[PDB]
Structures are given as structure tokens and as C-alpha cells.
Structure 1
Amino acid sequence: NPTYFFTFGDAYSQTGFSASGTQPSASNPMGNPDLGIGTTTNGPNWIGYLTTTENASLVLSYNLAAGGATIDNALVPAYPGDLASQFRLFEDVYADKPASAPWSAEDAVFGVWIGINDIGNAYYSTDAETYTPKLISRLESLVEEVYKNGGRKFLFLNVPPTSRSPLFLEQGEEVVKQHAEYLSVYNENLEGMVDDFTKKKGDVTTVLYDSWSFMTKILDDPTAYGFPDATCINDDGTSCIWWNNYHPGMKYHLLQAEDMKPKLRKLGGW
């Protein structure tokens, strides 16, 4: 009795899963590519860890996340595979519960980690208080498409402190601050939307995972987590928090998946 874990997001979540590649099964829960390929971590990412390491029962991962994605290119644009396009791929291939993914309300979990790129691209050019409600409203309307398909279990990750990635640190402390302040408003509005959606529907099980606070704890005390500092980069994915200037490594992702596990029990696969 599997949990069907459909995920949507950006490079913090990408694995290179193709809808025409090998599909998930009990012997191969990621489907494609192999566990530990296709990420920005040098190994598994949080989804691979949640599916194969932190799972309490069989989890099948259908990971539609794409590098560089924003929520909708009609708002903050970047790459063709925005969140809207990932929801369209879901609608095209899995929404109708095909034999390859015969999911139901009781066994499907929809995970969304989006906003890093919307904020990264719009923090200095838009007003957070008036603009981030538009981003969040568009996220909500995409979630509503899955709800209309019969989805009832949802996992939302807030935006982590990319303000303190080496990429942003190099732009100066006032840019880190401008970005961080915008990000905080986005995360507040995300929480409000998740709360409002949960209450309005009444029949959904939702988890808002505060990645921001978790990563912030590690950035503030890196050596307590086995990292020598909060700024070094190492593409082995484990010597430093950062695998490259803007993406954390597999060690961070494992620590996050481990932190997530207890909070995901109510979703069925953990």
C-alpha cells in the first residue's frame, strides 16, 4: 500500500525525473534516475531521503521539480518549467489516476517547495507586501487544481535563508537584508495561505515545514552539525553546507529530511 508522493519545486528539489522514464515501483521508488542522480547536492536530496531513508512504509516519488523554477512566468518569469508547467505535467500524466499511479485521497501526498527563485528575482524590484500575495494566490490556485483532482494531503516547505547563500553574501550585507526582509513577508503570507486553505476546505491534511528556521539554526551554529563554517562551498556535498554558491549539499538535505520525518507522520509515509 504505497504513498504516492508528487513533488513540485525548483533546483532544491530537482532530480531529473522524466514522466517517460522508468516509473516508480516498490523495487524502484524514485522511478528515474537512480537515487542520488540529478540533484544539486552531490547525492540524494530531501525527496530521495524522505522516499528511501526516512520512509515508514512504501513511498513512490514522482518528482516534477525543475531547476530555476518560479511559480508562474506570468508573474516572476525565469525558465519554461515553472511551477504552473509542473502542475500541467501532473494534469497531463497523473491527475487522472492511471494504472501506473492509481492514487487516491488517502494515499497521495503533494509536496511543494517554491519561492526561492521568485524572491531571488523580484526582491528589489517589487513591493513584498502587495506583490507576494499575488505569488501566493497563484500558488493557491495551482493547489486547487490538484484538490479538484481529489488530492487532500499537502506538504508545503517555506523558503530557506538563501539570503545567506554565498551567492547573496557576495552582493553585500544590505542586499542580504533586503532579500531576507522580502523573503520573510513571502513566508508569512505562505503560512497564512496554508492555514486559510486548510480551514476553508476542512477535509485536507496539511503540513507547513519551516525550512527557514531549520537551516537558520545550522547557519548560526554550523559546527554543532559537523560543518566547519556557514559559508564554505564543497561539491562533495558533505564538507560544507553549500554544494555550490546557491544550493546546499546532501548532508544538509539529509539533516532536513531527518528533521522533517516526525512532522510528516500525519501525511502517511513517515
Structure 2
Amino acid sequence: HKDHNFETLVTFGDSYTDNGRLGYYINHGGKAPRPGTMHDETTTTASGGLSWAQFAARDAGATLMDYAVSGAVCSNQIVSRYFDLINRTFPAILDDEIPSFQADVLFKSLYPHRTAENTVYAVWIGTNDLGWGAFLSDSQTPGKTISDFVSCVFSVLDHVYKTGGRRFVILNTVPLELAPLYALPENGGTLDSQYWNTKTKYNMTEYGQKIREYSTSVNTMLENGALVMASLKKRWPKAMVDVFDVHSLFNDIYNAPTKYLDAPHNVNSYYHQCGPAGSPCTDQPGSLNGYMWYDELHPSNKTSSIVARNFLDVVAGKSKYGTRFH
């Protein structure tokens, strides 16, 4: 615990990170928690267990403030999706998560001693922005591009910086073409999915290559844009900005699953298999620790634990997956 040089982990993102906040919106009339209150934490997330942020905070002996909301995009002004269950859009980072955090930091009951040195701020967003019903189906605000998505991520860091945060980690986009949702059926991919219930009406090869181009392009722009902003444009004076190349880590797990997963070392299918309505559902035999993917879109709790251990290495300034900018 004392081997990790922070006391508080603040996370922004989507269902890869969420530890109960969409559940709050669902159960409280589609409204965020009141300022100075957090949602109830769950230990059963979209991973089938803990999210990476929970593994990381537990191993660091850190308090987790997890503002991630399942379904989120970076900015609803760029692209949004309607969640009928809450009678509004899925919450987004700029529109919903950041305003919550900005209100909460004024409460000592939540943030007893938040300093530039003792708090790490992480953002992991893009899975929904780049995917079906968003940029992949050209559903964004007309004229917006994936370059505007990258600009939004840096705007998240501006808002954190403005509150006095200085230690930033951007987690880049995963290889979404390897998620069974976007993979070809011949390689374990879904047919019609709860996340894309018309997938089989499309050239699945073309859409999977398009999401590879979008994700790799965003990853190039996140790393070199962060370098420009941090090192040339003076955008975050005296901040430390890490980029965690979780894209390479996902490829490493996918390509060598016997090094990372328990039997059956499955990377191309998914543990929890639902019909295209999202119901009914069957779990595969054997351990969840033997699956890269809890479902066709979400990394397993086992994959999430691997993300967490590498994240802590990135925060320590000693990781093959970390690039640090002062």
C-alpha cells in the first residue's frame, strides 16, 4: 500500500470503470447523487466482478472516487445515446461526471485532504464514442470527427486541472476489433448482439476494420496530442500526464492468453452470453478467470485485474505501457 504514492484515485469513464454510478441514476429518477454524496459502490460491475479502478485503489490502499457511468461518452454535444430506462441520454464525462466531481471536491466529508501530490485522476473513455450508435454509425453531431473526441479528452483534464489536480493518466482505447461485439463470427464474434442487434445486416469485416482505424488513430492522437499540450503549449503547468497504452496490453493478453488467464485461456468468445434483447443469458462452464471478455464488449474481472496492476506501474513511472510527460 505505501509502495503506491497516492491516497485517492478519481476515475472518469464508462462501464469499463463504473462501480455503481449508472445504478444510482436508474434508482433515483435518472438524477446524479446530491453534491457531497457518492453512489453506493458494488463489487459486481460490467466485468462480472471488480472494475480495474477497484483493483487499483484496493492494491494502492487508496480511496476510490469513481465518477464513471456505464454507457458514457466523453461529450453529449459531440455524440449522445438515449437510455429509455432513465428518460434521458446516457450521462457523459463533460456533461455529468465532471460537474458532479466539481461540486463534490468542496465537501471535506468526501475529500478530507485532496492535494496535487496525493490524488491521481484517470480517464478511460472511447469504447462507446467510437462504436455502434456513435461514430461507427456516423450518429455524431453532423461535421464532428474523431479528432473532436480527442480534443474532448484533453478538455476533461482542463476541468480537473482547474480544481487543482495535477497527476493525470489517460487510458487509451482498446483494440475494439478484438471485442467479440466487433469481431467476425468465424473468429468467435457475435451475430446480432444486445449492443448491436442489427450487426448481421452489415459488412461486419468493413465495420471491424473501420473501428480498428478509429481506435488506432485516436490512440496516436492521444499520445502525441498529450505531448504537445504538456510539453509545448503549457496547457497544464506543473502537471504530470501519463498515457497508459492499454491497447498494447490488450493485444499482449489476446496474443498470449496462457501468460495472463486461467484455463480455458479464451480470448475470442465471452463468458456471459445473452440474446440480442439482452435476455435470456447463459454463463460458460469453468472460471471467469479463464475468459478475456465477461461479455462481447466488456473485459472480464481477470482482464481488469491485469489492467489495474499495469496502471499502478504507469503511476509509479515504471511501465512498458506508460509514456510520462511533464
TM-score after normalising by structure 1: 0.84
Cα distance in 2 for residues equivalent to 1:197 and 1:59: 28
Structure whose CA Rg is larger: 2
What is residue 123 of structure 1 aligned with on the other side?
136
Q: CA deviation at 1:75?
A: 0.4
Cα distance in 1 for residues equivalent to 2:161 and 2:249: 29
Percent identity, aligned pairs only, is 23
8 Å Cα contact 1:156-1:207 kept in structure 2: yes
Partner of 1:248, secondary structure, is coil
8 Å Cα contact 2:266-2:290 kept in structure 1: no
8 Å Cα contact 2:7-2:63 kept in structure 1: yes
Partner of 1:61, secondary structure, is strand
8 Å Cα contact 1:21-1:32 kept in structure 2: no
What is residue 8 of structure 2 aligned with on the other side?
4
Q: CA deviation at 1:175?
A: 1.8
> Does residue 78 of structure 2 align to residue 33 of structure 1?
no
Partner of 1:176, secondary structure, is helix
> Does residue 306 of structure 2 align to residue 255 of structure 1?
yes
Partner of 1:118, secondary structure, is coil
> Does residue 77 of structure 2 align to residue 74 of structure 1?
yes
Cα distance in 2 for residues equivalent to 1:2 and 1:225: 27
> Does residue 152 of structure 2 align to residue 138 of structure 1?
yes
8 Å Cα contact 2:168-2:242 kept in structure 1: yes
Closer/same/farther in 2, CA of residues 240 and 21 from structure 1, 3 Å limit: farther
Cα distance in 1 for residues equivalent to 2:63 and 2:242: 19
Unaligned runs of 5+ in 1: 25-30
> Does residue 166 of structure 2 align to residue 152 of structure 1?
yes
Closer/same/farther in 2, CA of residues 229 and 93 from structure 1, 3 Å limit: same
8 Å Cα contact 2:6-2:120 kept in structure 1: no
Report the number of matched residues: 254
8 Å Cα contact 1:68-1:117 kept in structure 2: yes
Cα distance in 1 for residues equivalent to 2:63 and 2:153: 24
Deviations 1:62-89 (A, max 9, x none): 0010011111111011233101110011
Q: CA deviation at 1:124?
A: 4.7
1:190 to 203, 217, 222: 222
Corresponding letter in the other structure for 2:78: L
8 Å Cα contact 1:124-1:179 kept in structure 2: no
Report matched runs for 1:163-202 at 5 Å. 163-169=177-183, 170=190, 171=199, 172-199=204-231, 200=234, 201-202=236-237
Corresponding letter in the other structure for 1:68: G
Corresponding letter in the other structure for 2:260: Y
Closer/same/farther in 2, CA of residues 239 and 22 from structure 1, 3 Å limit: farther
Deviations 1:129-150 (A, max 9, x none): x712211222222321211111
Point out the structure with the larger helix share: 1
Q: What is the aligned-residue RMSD (CA, Å)? A: 2.7
8 Å Cα contact 2:35-2:103 kept in structure 1: no
Cα distance in 2 for residues equivalent to 1:216 and 1:22: 39
> Does residue 93 of structure 2 align to residue 83 of structure 1?
yes
What is residue 323 of structure 2 aligned with on the other side?
none
Cα distance in 2 for residues equivalent to 1:213 and 1:189: 15
Q: CA deviation at 1:225?
A: 2.4
Cα distance in 2 for residues equivalent to 1:187 and 1:2: 26
Report matched runs for 1:8-27 at 5 Å. 8-17=12-21, 19=33
What is residue 231 of structure 1 aligned with on the other side?
268
8 Å Cα contact 1:50-1:257 kept in structure 2: yes
Closer/same/farther in 2, CA of residues 142 and 256 from structure 1, 3 Å limit: closer
8 Å Cα contact 2:73-2:79 kept in structure 1: yes
Corresponding letter in the other structure for 2:122: G
